[PDB]
Amino acid sequence: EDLRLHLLLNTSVTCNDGSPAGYYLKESRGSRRWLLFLEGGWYCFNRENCDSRYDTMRRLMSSRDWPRTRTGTGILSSQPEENPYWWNANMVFIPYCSSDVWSGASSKSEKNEYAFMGALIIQEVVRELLGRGLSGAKVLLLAGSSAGGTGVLLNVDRVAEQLEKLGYPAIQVRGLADSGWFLDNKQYRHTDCVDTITCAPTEAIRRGIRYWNGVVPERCRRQFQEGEEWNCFFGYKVYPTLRSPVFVVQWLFDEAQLTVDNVHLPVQEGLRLYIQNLGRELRHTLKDVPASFAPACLSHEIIIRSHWTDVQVKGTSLPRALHCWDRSLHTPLKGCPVHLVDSCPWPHCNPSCPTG
Ligand SMILES: *[C@@H]1O[C@H](CO)[C@@H](O)[C@H](O)[C@H]1NC(C)=O
Ligand SMILES: C=CC(=O)N1CCc2ccccc21
């Protein structure tokens, strides 16, 4: 139980219900590497569905019941056996308690039952960590899984700008977005947005942005303009606008993508074609992403799983690819690839896929 909880000293930066947000920290004296990981867990976008989430997913809306410690797993593990990549780094786990894909900047108030402060939580965590050793960092890797991976895309450049403005231009800010690269594609079976389950991701995010006072990266906002900021929650649209180096990890047949597409797994021709087209579209969107790891598996999330080391693309594991990425950020490297996208067209055509 190696990461210790710290509730934010600025108690105006809150989870959904107004309880203080916070972070779990395990310091590594002498390491100048800092890993800040954003937890995922869907989102909520109106009073009704946020109230339901508060009943049965309350740890994602409140810190009242958080434990004092958490065990670092996967990329957050301090054991080289489990984490060949960054086992000696300073480790930070930032719980997702804002239900806003890390985009919100609204407090609970007279007019707001809930606070959606995801973007401000990240900024406040960074601020308070500077006094705890982050001021001496050489690399700050902002990582995250699922909604936390999308949160990396939405926030990495803002962290970079924050540190620049605070007078720390020597900290190299980078992003690692795991399972947060979604497509705004056609559902396999269609449903107009009449309730939570029928509301497709583009519509729910459109509503959420207004409900959360959600913010997106500035260059992306300037491209899509007012009322169209939802586009910036989709990796293939926001990524080209980002200045910080971002490594993208994405299963080609992500289970959350399939869920929002209304796919539930003998597969007949229509569904077969749909699934193959999804993998091909995902592969297409990553063709010009130089640092990426995209295995042909039906799964969801990878970086904080204890067996994250098992999967390989073209014989290279994700910890190796991330190490090669580090070396590239010191022309391609002999035997140390950073762009690893499967080309086989069906889930589990890669033998190293998670077994489930
Ligand atoms: C606390 O956080 C809020 C929201 O980000 C900010 O407006 C305020 O300046 C912060 N106060 C302090 C003392 O850091
Ligand atoms: C796993 C759920 C999730 O996090 N989803 C689903 C679709 C989407 C679009 C943008 C950002 C996040 C998400």
XYZ file of C-alpha atoms and ligand atoms in Angstrom:
383
model
C 0.000 0.000 0.000
C 2.721 2.397 -1.095
C 0.956 5.554 -2.390
C -0.309 7.872 0.367
C -3.398 10.066 0.105
C -3.096 13.845 0.260
C -6.302 15.855 0.083
C -5.852 19.168 -1.684
C -4.855 22.002 0.621
C -6.997 24.272 -1.558
C -10.321 22.818 -0.469
C -12.206 24.898 -3.077
C -10.942 22.403 -5.691
C -13.453 19.643 -5.134
C -14.935 16.382 -6.254
C -18.515 16.388 -7.554
C -20.128 16.626 -4.114
C -17.867 19.411 -2.820
C -15.538 17.167 -0.843
C -11.854 18.004 -1.440
C -10.147 16.353 -4.372
C -6.673 14.922 -3.857
C -3.881 12.648 -4.999
C -1.926 9.599 -3.842
C 1.847 10.033 -3.803
C 4.887 7.791 -3.422
C 8.037 9.874 -3.606
C 11.273 8.517 -5.044
C 14.124 10.603 -3.642
C 16.766 11.314 -6.246
C 14.554 10.507 -9.220
C 13.690 13.561 -11.286
C 10.938 11.647 -13.135
C 7.320 12.242 -12.102
C 4.375 10.140 -13.291
C 0.928 11.699 -12.728
C -1.804 9.186 -13.592
C -5.430 10.162 -14.275
C -7.979 7.524 -13.319
C -10.901 6.823 -15.640
C -14.501 5.746 -15.182
C -17.044 7.070 -17.729
C -18.742 10.408 -16.852
C -22.185 11.824 -16.163
C -23.824 14.671 -18.004
C -27.114 15.672 -16.320
C -28.705 15.784 -12.876
C -30.524 12.484 -13.353
C -27.582 10.350 -14.457
C -25.182 12.074 -12.050
C -27.602 11.355 -9.188
C -27.616 7.674 -10.139
C -23.813 7.626 -10.293
C -23.744 9.221 -6.846
C -25.797 6.324 -5.435
C -23.693 3.435 -6.708
C -20.375 4.905 -7.945
C -19.810 7.415 -5.171
C -16.016 7.051 -4.970
C -16.031 8.564 -8.486
C -17.895 11.615 -7.135
C -16.543 12.157 -3.623
C -13.453 11.702 -1.480
C -15.406 11.021 1.724
C -14.736 7.261 1.535
C -11.271 7.198 -0.074
C -8.703 4.974 1.657
C -5.575 6.503 3.114
C -3.333 4.447 0.788
C -3.383 2.699 -2.594
C -1.052 0.095 -4.077
C 0.761 1.184 -7.224
C 0.228 -1.320 -10.028
C 1.515 -1.604 -13.564
C 3.193 1.628 -14.624
C 2.574 2.903 -11.060
C 4.485 -0.030 -9.524
C 7.844 0.658 -7.893
C 9.054 -2.903 -8.528
C 11.171 -3.289 -11.686
C 9.752 -6.789 -12.087
C 6.259 -5.314 -12.596
C 7.298 -1.971 -14.121
C 10.385 -2.266 -16.340
C 9.767 1.259 -17.622
C 9.618 3.761 -14.735
C 9.823 1.741 -11.498
C 12.055 4.364 -9.840
C 9.876 7.385 -10.646
C 7.900 9.520 -8.246
C 4.393 8.058 -8.508
C 1.119 10.008 -8.351
C -2.377 8.554 -8.743
C -5.047 11.240 -9.165
C -8.527 9.802 -8.444
C -11.262 10.656 -10.914
C -14.011 12.293 -8.844
C -15.279 14.953 -11.264
C -17.195 12.789 -13.808
C -16.281 15.258 -16.573
C -13.498 13.496 -18.540
C -11.117 15.822 -16.640
C -12.482 18.848 -18.521
C -14.564 20.734 -15.972
C -14.115 24.125 -14.359
C -17.337 24.709 -12.401
C -17.906 24.780 -8.636
C -20.935 23.569 -6.724
C -23.137 26.584 -6.101
C -26.613 28.068 -5.814
C -27.216 26.983 -9.414
C -25.116 23.761 -9.575
C -25.889 20.601 -7.590
C -22.448 19.218 -8.474
C -18.984 20.610 -9.052
C -17.139 19.575 -12.206
C -13.547 20.591 -11.605
C -11.422 17.987 -13.428
C -9.261 20.520 -15.269
C -8.695 22.503 -12.057
C -7.952 19.375 -10.028
C -5.041 18.598 -12.359
C -3.743 22.163 -12.119
C -4.032 22.172 -8.319
C -2.304 18.799 -7.934
C 0.598 20.065 -10.048
C 0.778 23.280 -8.004
C 0.893 21.476 -4.665
C 3.397 18.878 -5.898
C 5.906 21.583 -6.850
C 6.468 22.145 -3.140
C 6.952 18.386 -2.639
C 9.811 17.866 -5.117
C 8.202 18.378 -8.528
C 10.090 21.683 -8.780
C 13.225 19.594 -9.361
C 11.725 17.380 -12.062
C 13.188 16.865 -15.506
C 10.201 14.940 -16.935
C 6.552 15.051 -15.892
C 4.620 12.277 -17.665
C 0.874 12.924 -17.466
C -0.664 9.493 -18.026
C -4.210 8.172 -17.764
C -6.556 5.361 -18.705
C -9.980 5.443 -20.401
C -11.606 8.795 -19.504
C -8.232 9.533 -17.900
C -6.528 8.909 -21.231
C -8.828 11.424 -22.900
C -8.032 13.668 -19.929
C -4.337 13.507 -20.869
C -5.167 14.750 -24.355
C -7.307 17.563 -22.939
C -4.832 18.663 -20.260
C -1.195 17.872 -21.163
C -0.574 21.186 -22.948
C -2.253 23.113 -20.124
C 0.118 21.502 -17.605
C 3.018 22.485 -19.857
C 1.780 26.081 -20.050
C 1.156 26.161 -16.288
C 4.726 25.119 -15.488
C 6.128 27.591 -18.015
C 4.137 30.460 -16.503
C 5.123 29.415 -12.962
C 8.796 29.628 -13.941
C 9.739 25.964 -14.497
C 10.635 25.840 -18.217
C 13.071 22.952 -17.634
C 10.372 20.405 -16.749
C 9.580 18.430 -19.897
C 5.851 17.675 -19.911
C 4.733 14.624 -21.893
C 1.507 12.655 -22.183
C 0.623 8.960 -22.155
C -3.010 8.414 -23.235
C -4.220 4.842 -22.661
C -7.622 3.700 -23.990
C -8.801 7.289 -24.440
C -8.643 7.502 -28.254
C -12.266 7.143 -29.361
C -14.003 7.416 -32.719
C -17.180 9.433 -33.268
C -18.358 6.708 -35.644
C -21.720 5.221 -36.610
C -23.222 2.861 -34.056
C -23.778 -0.725 -35.172
C -27.387 -0.267 -34.010
C -28.747 3.276 -33.850
C -30.588 5.086 -31.056
C -31.591 8.741 -30.883
C -30.409 10.493 -27.704
C -33.563 10.094 -25.618
C -31.916 8.961 -22.349
C -28.501 8.022 -20.964
C -28.187 4.610 -22.629
C -29.416 5.780 -26.047
C -27.257 8.948 -26.080
C -24.198 8.519 -28.317
C -20.813 9.870 -27.183
C -20.873 13.032 -29.319
C -24.248 14.070 -27.899
C -23.457 13.177 -24.279
C -20.192 15.139 -24.452
C -21.989 18.051 -26.126
C -24.397 18.124 -23.178
C -21.634 17.457 -20.652
C -19.503 20.399 -21.798
C -22.372 22.806 -21.075
C -23.265 20.987 -17.835
C -19.631 20.876 -16.656
C -18.377 24.185 -18.039
C -15.899 21.947 -19.840
C -12.695 23.310 -21.348
C -10.568 22.005 -24.211
C -7.036 22.790 -25.452
C -6.774 26.268 -26.924
C -5.592 25.441 -30.444
C -8.291 22.803 -30.822
C -10.904 25.209 -29.466
C -9.792 27.797 -32.027
C -10.202 25.311 -34.879
C -13.660 24.022 -33.975
C -15.011 27.203 -32.327
C -17.994 27.865 -30.102
C -20.536 25.076 -29.770
C -18.232 22.537 -31.445
C -15.709 21.978 -28.642
C -16.987 18.405 -28.267
C -14.764 17.570 -31.259
C -11.706 18.069 -29.048
C -12.636 15.042 -26.900
C -11.843 12.797 -29.888
C -8.156 11.904 -30.019
C -7.675 11.960 -33.780
C -8.988 15.563 -33.859
C -7.281 16.971 -30.762
C -3.913 15.186 -31.056
C -2.680 17.142 -34.143
C -3.205 20.401 -32.221
C -1.015 19.377 -29.249
C 2.546 20.583 -28.692
C 3.640 18.184 -25.922
C 4.898 14.731 -26.985
C 2.066 12.232 -26.470
C 2.342 8.453 -26.646
C -1.005 6.859 -27.576
C -1.934 3.377 -26.309
C -5.184 2.051 -27.782
C -6.638 -1.404 -28.284
C -7.920 -1.586 -31.857
C -11.178 -3.162 -30.640
C -11.625 -1.245 -27.417
C -14.500 -2.585 -25.313
C -15.715 0.909 -24.361
C -15.717 1.918 -28.037
C -17.756 -1.184 -28.838
C -20.131 -0.411 -25.951
C -20.862 3.116 -27.185
C -21.269 1.580 -30.662
C -23.972 -0.774 -29.285
C -21.937 -3.921 -30.013
C -22.353 -6.817 -27.568
C -20.452 -10.058 -28.169
C -21.500 -16.723 -34.033
C -20.753 -13.354 -35.652
C -22.585 -12.803 -38.943
C -21.445 -10.791 -41.941
C -22.796 -7.370 -40.948
C -21.153 -7.386 -37.529
C -17.967 -8.945 -38.910
C -17.658 -6.126 -41.450
C -18.470 -3.570 -38.741
C -15.728 -4.859 -36.422
C -13.134 -5.122 -39.190
C -13.959 -1.592 -40.354
C -13.560 -0.292 -36.783
C -10.083 -1.780 -36.487
C -9.119 -0.378 -39.880
C -10.448 3.083 -39.006
C -8.586 3.075 -35.694
C -5.397 1.959 -37.453
C -5.861 4.744 -40.007
C -6.138 7.410 -37.291
C -2.827 6.235 -35.773
C -0.856 6.060 -39.040
C 0.767 9.467 -38.380
C 1.074 9.105 -34.603
C 4.814 8.382 -34.199
C 4.623 7.131 -30.593
C 1.802 4.611 -30.304
C 1.027 1.054 -29.213
C -2.168 -0.362 -30.671
C -2.684 -4.131 -30.381
C -5.434 -6.019 -32.220
C -7.314 -7.089 -29.093
C -10.772 -6.802 -27.576
C -9.925 -5.283 -24.186
C -9.937 -1.999 -22.244
C -7.112 -0.136 -20.444
C -3.562 -1.471 -19.952
C -1.087 0.781 -18.189
C -2.036 0.168 -14.495
C -2.750 -3.556 -14.915
C -0.193 -5.713 -13.105
C 0.342 -7.875 -16.223
C 0.663 -4.877 -18.560
C 4.097 -6.227 -19.575
C 2.643 -9.287 -21.343
C 1.213 -7.807 -24.542
C 3.533 -7.274 -27.502
C 3.158 -5.771 -30.966
C 5.688 -6.997 -33.536
C 7.601 -8.574 -30.648
C 7.883 -5.367 -28.577
C 6.169 -4.864 -25.227
C 4.623 -1.586 -24.096
C 7.245 -0.998 -21.366
C 9.924 -1.436 -24.032
C 8.145 0.910 -26.457
C 7.867 3.531 -23.708
C 11.568 3.147 -22.924
C 12.315 3.584 -26.635
C 10.142 6.708 -26.583
C 12.234 8.059 -23.706
C 15.382 7.434 -25.748
C 13.883 9.120 -28.812
C 13.265 12.268 -26.709
C 16.864 12.530 -25.471
C 15.915 9.558 -36.367
C 14.749 6.051 -35.471
C 16.541 3.724 -33.082
C 17.964 0.320 -33.990
C 15.733 -2.352 -32.484
C 13.902 0.190 -30.276
C 10.632 1.034 -32.052
C 8.088 3.571 -30.871
C 5.304 3.196 -33.487
C 3.670 -0.217 -32.942
C 0.266 -0.703 -34.581
C -1.080 -4.169 -35.355
C -2.226 -4.745 -38.910
C -4.126 -7.994 -38.443
C -7.871 -7.419 -38.742
C -9.696 -9.354 -35.974
C -9.602 -9.318 -32.153
C -6.977 -11.719 -30.760
C -5.184 -12.094 -34.087
C -2.287 -10.999 -31.901
C -1.460 -14.065 -29.738
C -0.311 -11.868 -26.809
C -3.727 -10.264 -26.260
C -5.087 -10.425 -22.697
C -6.938 -13.669 -22.047
C -9.663 -12.143 -19.869
C -7.905 27.569 -5.111
O -8.398 27.036 -6.340
C -9.279 27.924 -7.041
C -9.811 27.161 -8.233
O -8.762 26.773 -9.110
C -8.512 29.180 -7.432
O -9.405 30.098 -8.052
C -7.907 29.835 -6.199
O -7.053 30.901 -6.594
C -7.090 28.832 -5.386
N -6.649 29.440 -4.142
C -5.431 29.257 -3.624
C -5.157 29.966 -2.333
O -4.590 28.549 -4.171
C -15.041 4.199 -21.306
C -15.866 5.206 -21.443
C -15.308 6.539 -21.907
O -14.512 7.115 -21.232
N -15.740 7.113 -23.166
C -16.690 6.508 -24.081
C -16.708 7.367 -25.318
C -15.831 8.573 -25.022
C -15.553 9.701 -25.805
C -14.690 10.671 -25.297
C -14.133 10.495 -24.018
C -14.411 9.373 -23.248
C -15.284 8.391 -23.754
